[PDB]
Structure formats: C-alpha cells, structure tokens
Amino acid sequence: FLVDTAMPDTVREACDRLIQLLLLHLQKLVHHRGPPPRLVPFLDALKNHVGELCGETLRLERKRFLWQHQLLGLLSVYTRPSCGPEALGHLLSRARSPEELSLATQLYAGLVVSLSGLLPLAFRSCLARVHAGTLQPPFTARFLRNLALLVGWEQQGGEGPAALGAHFGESASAHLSDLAPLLLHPEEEVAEAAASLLAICPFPSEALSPSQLLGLVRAGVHRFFASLRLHGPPGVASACQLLTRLSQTSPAGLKAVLQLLVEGALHRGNTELFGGQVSRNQQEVIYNTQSLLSLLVHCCSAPGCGECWGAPILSPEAAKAVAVTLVESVCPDAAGAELAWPPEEHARATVERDLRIGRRFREQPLLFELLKLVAAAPPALCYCSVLLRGLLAALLGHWEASRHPDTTHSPWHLEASCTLVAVMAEGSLLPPALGNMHEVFSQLAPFEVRLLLLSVWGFLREHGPLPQKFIFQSERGRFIRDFSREGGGEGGPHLAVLHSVLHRNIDRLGLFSGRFQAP
C-alpha cells in the first residue's frame, strides 16, 4: 500500500518521503550495534514474503524496484536465516531480463558487502527446487539459463564481475553433477539450458571424478544425441562444447567422451540420422555426419600460427581410440586381432565373420567415414587391419561369386573396394603406385579387381599394417610411413598384376597409365 501510494500528491510525497525514511530506518535497525541483534517484526513478516517481495522487485517499476530492492537487501542482512541467497535464487529462477538479472547482481553487491557465499546458496536452493516438483520446469530452465548468463557474464569478466567478485563460473563449477541429470531432464528447455550451462561452466579446478566425468559425459552425449535427433546439426552446440571440454579435462575424459559418443551413435538408436539401415533425406544425413565429424575432429585435434593455410594434427592416440572402438563395434570377436596380414587361404576359414563385417558396412555407411578419420592419423589405421582384411575378403568373395561381365551391376561392392583401397592408401598402408588402383576399378571385370584386391592383400602380407614401421617425424609432428626404407615398399611384385591388368585392358585403361608409374 505505502509503495503503491507513494506513486493527493501531498500524500504521495508524504509516502515517498515515508518510504525513503522507512528504508533508511530499516537500514539502521537491520544492522547496527556491531548485544543481541535488532529485531524487526516488519521484516519478520517479510521473510514469509521475501519471494513475493522479489516478485514485486522484478516488476522493476519506476521507483518500486529501488525501494523494494533496498528492502530485500535489508531483509537479507536482517534475517539471521539470511534470505539473501533465497532472494537471489528466486530472482535467478524468475528474472526474465538481463536487467531483471541485474537486480540479482545489484542485490548480491548490496549483500556481498555484508554477506558471504550468497550465490552458492542461491544456486543450491534453486537446484533443490528444480530436481523436486518445485520450481516448475519453466522456472527451472529460467534459473538454468540465468545461471548460464551469470557464469558467462563473469567469464567475459570486466568491471562488473570483478567488483562484484561473484565467481559465477566457479560457483556453478561445483554444481556440475546436478545439471547432468537436467541433461536427462525430459523438458527440453531444462535439458538444453543445463547443456548450455555445463558447456560453459568451468570444470572443477582439481579434476573430474570417474563418476563426475562419466555422468557428465553420459548426460552430454545424451544431450548431443537427443538434440541431433530433435534439433539437427545446429542444435548440439552445448552438448558438443560440454563433451569437448570434458575431453580436455584428461585423456580419460577424451576417450570417455569419444567412446560414449561412438556407442550411442552406433547404437540401434540414433542411427537413422546417419544413413543407417533400420526413407530418409540424404542432405540431412550428410550434414548430421558433418556435425559429429566436426565434433570428433575438434576433440581429436591437438589443441594449439603454423602458417595461415595449415591445419592442426589429429592426435594418433585419439584416432587409435576411434579405431579400437570401431573394431569393437564392428568385429567384436577379434579372433584374428593381430595387425599383420595372414595368408589369403585363411579367408575361407572365417567366411561368416567377414560376411558379417561386410553386412555391417553395407547397413551403416558411416563406418567408412570413421575409417577415413582413423586413416587421417597414419599409425591409427594399423589398428583397423582386422576390419580392412575383413572388408577385403568380403569384396574378394563377392567378386569370386560375381558372374556379371562388368562391375557396374554391383555398385555397393565396387564402391566398397574403391573406398577400402582409398582408406588403406590414405593411412599409408599402401604405396601411391598401388594406391591409385581404386580409380580403375569401375572399368574392370570382377576377376581383374579380385586379382587387384588379392595384390593388396599380398602387399599387406609382405609389409603389414604395423605402427612400428611409422617413424614419428618430429619436424612436423606427424608419423611418416617410408615405403622406400621398408624395402620393396613401392610394390615390386605387387604392381606386376596391376600392370598386366592395364596391358590386357589397354583399349580402356590407356589414359590411366599415369596413376601407376613407379615414381
């Protein structure tokens, strides 16, 4: 009444003067004689209405926010239970504007000069409301986004956060394990607001616990997957940032992030986004693939101009982890896990496993993409030698069973042979002379390409995809496979079959002779 009747103008100025005098007298009574503390029954009834008082302050009316915000500060300093964090939490969960949020920072400044630990208590009050039925999910997402606003506002620290000393990011840094269940929160507003907070909220300065890291990564990959199913390529940013930052916490964090992402992606769920079998648009699949390949390369690249045209080097350890999780997901038995290649007579012994690998490749086109990502790091493709040999054997068997006079009647097998050869050559498991062989696959009958893939198998038998053949070139920081130093690494006897195939089909392969020259 008095506030509404401070805005007969003699009564209105009497009430404005009255509210000024009342605020200043309450300031006197709240905190004086610093002997029991002074008791304000007026404020003793206001602790029952501190939330309503905050609501009337967030109204931010001409002078009502000044008077009522001063009164909330005096209530906070007065109430021995210190409703200041309670007021701050209600503000954070019910402020709708950066000025409504500015009310919280002004309150904290008016309170941090007299009170301590206000924001952590406000945060825990809000979150306790959140995970209960309290602070209904609109209010929950409001508090989540407002705490994200606070954390960022401190993180873009100027005079505001510094004089405030809020430590919004640091204060929220201890509440990581409550926002992760909010990543699993059914309300997508709550889920993505927690995603945004955790993406920007700094991780504990000491470390992230195996439980902390595992739950945070589980919730971050869950947010990534739900938002990629639901929102598409543009909607995974907060989950991606949270996951990448979790990856930069430790190598354990990196490998956990990548492996949860892989298991969820190669899960029977979250697979229609990526061309996986059991009609979908091809553009959306292509650009979802671009999305998680961007996340993968961001997590895999070594952080930290190296010329304006160069690119960061993918870590061989991260690509090795990608290779091993690929092998576990596609070929789990790993009865022939040894990297070097066995005799081709062993192919008929493992027909079932290699056909299963081929069927898995056919159902999921994303497997080739991860093969190329692994082959980006030179030594990592050595660990994919089992998958490479299985795909090569499946292609060889299909070309054995291919009765067509040409190879265009089997598009999937032709492209699988071409892409397998491209992956193997890209990982420097094959010489460039024997790596240009996939280009002439389409102009060949099935038995020529079968003999060519048998030559690939023979070369990978003689040399073998072994990491120790890769000498780490410290000048550029990338492992280099020197086939010249290996001895016959340019395909001495293996290029003979390719050249014979070129000679036999010289009427069609004449213009491609430049791709198979010795130098």
């Binding site: 605020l23 610093g34 606070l150 300065s205 902390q212 996939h438």
Partner: protein, 648 residues
C-alpha cells in the same frame, strides 16, 4: 603434377566442378598424394592441399556428397584466406541461374553448414556476406541464422551497483544514505572520505558500529579500540572489517587495497598496530597466492616465503598474535615442499612453543626420509605417538563429545583443521597412511603403512571413535582434492565394503579402476585390482546379491576363485541380471558350471544360452594362448564398464 604447376591443376578442378568430367576418385587420389607430399617437406604445399581439398569438397556438395574429414581439419583453425578461397570456389563452381534447384539447395545447405562449423562469428558474417551465400538459400533464413548464432554467445550486462533510492530532505535521510553508501562501499579511500564527512557532521558519535556484519577478532579488539583519535580508530576498524569480509567473499583486490591503505595509515602513530597489520598482510598474501596464484602448481615468488620465515622466527611477546596466521604459514611451508627449513632451519623454541610448527617439522621429517628403510622410522614413530596422544582420552567420555581431556599437544578439531589446509599430495598421503595405521590397531589398504609401529601404549585411552571420524573425513577430503586418485578410491571402497556399503564399495573400486585404467579401457593394474580388491568387490556383489558379478569378478583374480563363483552362481536371489552377464565370463569352467546348473534346474533357455556361450571359437581352450588372453581382458574391460554404468 609431374611439372609441379599445381595452381593450374586447382584451376582445372574448379572448372571441372562445372562439368564433372574429372573422376571423383581421381580428385580424391590427387588430394591424398598432395597431402602426402606436403607431409614430407615443401611446407608451401599446405596451401595447395587446402585448395584442392576445398575444390573437391565443393564439387562433392554439388554432386550431393558428404564433407571430407580434411575439410574440417583445415577449418579447425579457420582463417580469412582459407574461408575466402572456399567461398570463391563455391561461387565459381555453382553456375547460378543454370544449376537447377538441386545444385542450389545442396550448395546453399553446404554454405549453412560451413557457417555452423566456424568458431569465430566474424567468419560467419564474412561467409553470410558472400554473394553466393546470399543468393543461394532464401531471403528469410539468413537473419534467422545470424540471430540464432548471435545468442550462441550473447553479451550479458549486469548492474553491479546495488539500487539506491537516494531521493537529502532531512539530516536523518543523509546520515542513513551515507551509511548505506559506506556499507555498500568496497574501496578504502571512499570509506575514508565517508567517515571523515560523517565525523564532520556529527559531534562525538562513532561510526565503526553502523553495520553489525562487520567483524574484527577479539584478540585485536583491545588494541584497536585504544586509539585516542576517534576518526582514526573508526577508519582502521572499518578497513579491517571490510578487508576481512572481502577476503571471505574472495574479493582479493579490494581487500588488498583496504589493507594497504590501513597499513600506510597505521605507521605514523602505532608500532603494535603496524606489526599486527604486517601479520595480516602476510596472511592475505598467502591466501591470495594459494587461491589465484596457485591452483596450478607454481612456486611462490620467494618473497612470501621469506616473510613467512621471518614471521615464524618473530618471537615478539607484546604484539597480539593469531594462531591461524601461524597455522596458515606452516601449511604454506608444507604445501610447497619446504621440508629442509622445517626440519633443520627451524628454531628450537618454536617447536616447544607452537604445536603447529612441531607437527609440521615431524611431517616434513617423515616425508623427506621415505626412501630410507630405517631412517624414516625414527621420525614416523614420533609422529605416531604424537598423533595417537592427540586422538586419546585421559578420563562415559568421548573425544568428539568433549573435545578436551586429550593427551596430545593439539585438539582433534585443531588437528583436522590443520590437515584440511594442506594440498601437497605427499603430506596428505602420509597423513592418510598414519591415520589408517591408527584405524586398524584395535581392513583397508593405503600406501606407506609399514613405516609405523604396530604395538601401541595405552590402547584403552585411545578414543577410536574420534580416529574413525578423522579417517572418513580425510578420505572424503582427499577424494575431493583429487577425484581421479585411484588409491584413494580403493581406500574408500575398502571402507564401504567394511561398512557393508557394498554398493558404494563396488562403486569406488570401479572409480579406482577407471583411474588406473582409463574407465577400464586398459587392463587395470593388478596392484589396485588386487586379489583383495577384486575379492572385496566380489563380496560386495555377493552381499548385494550380485552373484553373477561375483562369478565374473571371481575370474578377475590371478587364479579364478571357482569356489566363490560357483557359490554365487548357485544363488537365485540375484539383482545382477544373471543371463545378461554370462558374456563377461571368459572362463570355460564357470560357464560349464552354469550349463550344468541350468540343465539341472530345468532352465532350458538358460541352458541353451550358456551352451552357446561356451560354443565359441574365441573361447576355445585350445586357442594358442593369445586369443584367450585377449578375450579375457576384453571381457574384463567390458564387464568393468558395465559395472561403471551400473554404479557410476
């Protein structure tokens, strides 16, 4: 390519993106060979690699195909040159007004997605300002992209000045308003001006009591209220109160400013105040260093160390001293491995005067002698008696309930608080080992345990309740200071197994394995998943009725505990998904026992499942000793990860 004129080759790709006469596999092969050439030497080829990759990517988009990995690799560090070259390749190869809707839509969507992958927002304008981008998509989604990307990193402004309805009609309004400003104030000079004008307006009223939230320790109250001048006393009191309050709220700069102002103020008229304030400045510098300057493992600026050494060797009786400052100085010495000073250079009288210094000397001596087989004992012993006397009771009585009647030089609460101020891992683990050795006298595995004596004097006087409180508090604090500390996780898991918190015990064993291994990616080192640790998680599973987990955990040991595995598998009150976890059993005997167990009970379906589990070529016992070992370790890893998911 033979002649090295790569620029015209890139031009051929750009032109062929119109015609698509060049094979796509040919473009991929030449891109691969260019990257291989750039990887050996010829650092100028990196630009050519990006150029041919961007042309390839643009053609692939036009032919409706995916974006290459190297394309995203080259945009890991986006540049004006890179992105502009990509954009001009985009525009030169689109063939607008003749590309039909397929090429336009594909290429515009690629432009969107390359906008999405940029870390820098100005890169996303300078693509969004590219003519092909503006022509390709639509006339309505561009602003949508720009605004939806602006709120990705929106600018937040928050008023930090608390509101003030300072509408000066009466003297009371002004006095309250200036009190409000002073209490809202944080800068010492504004405080001094406010107090000066407050004294000028009033006659004899003091102004250090206009806020009860301002606090000053009682040991300094007598010396701070003895100032003859009223204004000087008020200003010193307010500066101390707000400096301490800012130190509490981690407002280091403002507290340092207030403290420097009061320090330069008190030099003129009081030496006792000057010395007390030098001690306060040392404490503030120590705390600020450990908070901001530390937090990453960097040495002190060597001037804080000298000040700490001078304060330890101060020996001034007239000055009022705070024990917290000495405790913080000892903690600062112990956290930065300053063992040599605390062991040899410490004055003798300080050990007999301050128990904190004596305890720090003992800890430094017992930490610096760790490599010594018998030299370490000479100090580990004395530490053992001093700590057990701290945690003992002379004369129903409880150490925690009383907090007196202790035989040590320090109270248990004081000892716990002093330990709580230590971050150095070696000191922390030595204290953990000492208190764990105190825990089992009258199990849990924790590092350096044989250095402490076993037989103890006055076993009855030792209030083991206080000891157990201290050990649980210490293990949880250490797991907080290093969440990824495997041995501490093993300790906590052993505790929870002892406290029959078998779920929490399993959970912390799993955290320890996730630390030793990388979330069980590697074979967890046997020194941590020992036969004890694995058998205790076995027993936790048994007593949580996680019996198939017992069976899988029984084979985790060096020898497969077939007895406990078969006992658990016999159990039918299981909360661990019996049939879903038989895949984790690499042992043929355990699975054979499962087959007979399911056949005798009539469980035809489970019998068939176990038979198929045995009927594997990889699990054949005739495998040449490498397939079986790999299968066993992979089942270890996957079973441990399933336990991770079921427990953390």
């Amino acid at each position: 390519l033979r002649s090295g004129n790569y620029q015209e080759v890139i031009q051929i790709f750009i032109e062929d993106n119109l015609t698509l006469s060049l094979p796509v596999q040919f473009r991929q092969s030449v891109l691969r060979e260019l990257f291989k050439k750039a990887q050996q030497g010829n650092e100028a080829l990196d630009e050519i690699c990006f150029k041919v990759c961007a042309c390839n990517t643009v053609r692939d988009i036009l032919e409706g195909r995916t974006i290459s990995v190297q394309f995203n690799q080259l945009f890991l560090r986006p540049n004006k040159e890179k992105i502009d070259f990509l954009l001009e390749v985009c525009s030169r190869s689109v063939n607008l007004e003749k590309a039909s809707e397929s090429l336009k839509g594909n290429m515009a969507a690629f432009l969107k997605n390359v906008c999405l992958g940029l870390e820098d927002l100005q890169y996303v304008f300078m693509i969004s300002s590219h003519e092909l981008f503006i022509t390709l998509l639509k006339d309505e989604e561009r602003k949508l992209l720009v605004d939806q990307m602006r709120k990705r990193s929106p600018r937040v402004n928050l008023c930090i000045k608390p509101v003030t309805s300072f509408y000066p009609a009466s003297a009371s309004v002004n006095i309250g308003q200036l009190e409000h400003q002073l209490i809202l104030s944080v800068d010492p000079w504004r405080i001094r001006q406010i107090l000066i004008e407050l004294h000028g307006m009033t006659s004899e009223r003091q102004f250090w009591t206009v806020s009860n939230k301002w606090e000053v320790p009682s040991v300094y109250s007598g010396v701070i209220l003895g100032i003859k001048d009223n204004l000087t006393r008020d200003l010193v009191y307010i500066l101390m109160a707000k400096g301490l309050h800012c130190s509490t709220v981690k407002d280091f700069s403002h507290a340092k400013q207030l403290f420097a102002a009061c320090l330069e103020l008190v030099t003129e008229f009081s030496p006792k105040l000057r010395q007390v304030m030098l001690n306060e400045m040392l404490l503030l510098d120590i705390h600020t260093h450990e908070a901001g300057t530390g937090q990453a493992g960097e040495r002190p600026p060597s001037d804080l160390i000298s000040r700490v050494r001078g304060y330890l060797e101060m020996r001034l009786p007239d000055i009022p001293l705070r024990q917290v400052i000495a405790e913080e100085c000892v903690a600062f010495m112990l956290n930065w491995r300053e063992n040599e000073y605390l062991t040899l250079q410490v004055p003798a009288f300080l050990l007999q005067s301050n128990p904190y210094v004596k305890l720090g000397q003992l800890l430094a001596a017992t930490c610096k002698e760790l490599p010594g087989p018998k030299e370490s004992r000479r100090t580990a012993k004395d530490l053992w008696e001093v700590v057990v006397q701290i945690c003992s009771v002379s004369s129903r009585v409880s150490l925690i309930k009383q907090r007196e009647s202790t035989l040590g030089i320090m109270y248990r609460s004081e000892l716990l608080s002093f330990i709580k101020k230590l971050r150095e891992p070696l000191v922390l683990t030595i204290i953990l080992s000492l208190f764990v050795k105190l825990h089992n006298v009258r199990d849990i595995t924790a590092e350096h345990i044989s250095i402490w004596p076993s037989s103890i004097p006055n076993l009855q006087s030792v209030d083991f309740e206080a000891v157990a409180i201290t050990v649980k508090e210490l293990v949880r604090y250490t797991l907080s200071i290093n969440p990824n500390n495997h041995s501490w996780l093993i300790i906590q898991a052993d505790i929870y197994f002892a406290t029959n918190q078998y779920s929490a015990a399993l959970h912390y064993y799993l955290q320890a394995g996730a630390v030793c291994s990388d979330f069980f990616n590697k074979a967890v080192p046997p020194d941590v998943y020992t036969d004890q640790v694995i058998k205790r998680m076995i027993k936790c599973c048994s007593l949580l009725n996680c019996h198939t987990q017992v069976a899988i955990l029984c084979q985790f040991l060096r020898e497969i505990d077939y007895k406990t595995a078969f006992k658990s598998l016999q159990e039918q009150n299981s909360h661990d998904a019996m049939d879903s976890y038989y895949d984790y059993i690499w042992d043929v005997t355990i699975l054979e026992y499962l087959t007979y167990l399911h056949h005798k009970r009539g469980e035809t379906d489970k019998r068939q499942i176990a038979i198929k589990a045995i009927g594997q070529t990889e699990l054949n016992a005739s495998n040449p000793e490498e397939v079986l070992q790999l299968a066993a370790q992979r089942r270890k890893k996957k079973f441990l990860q399933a336990m991770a998911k079921l427990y953390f």
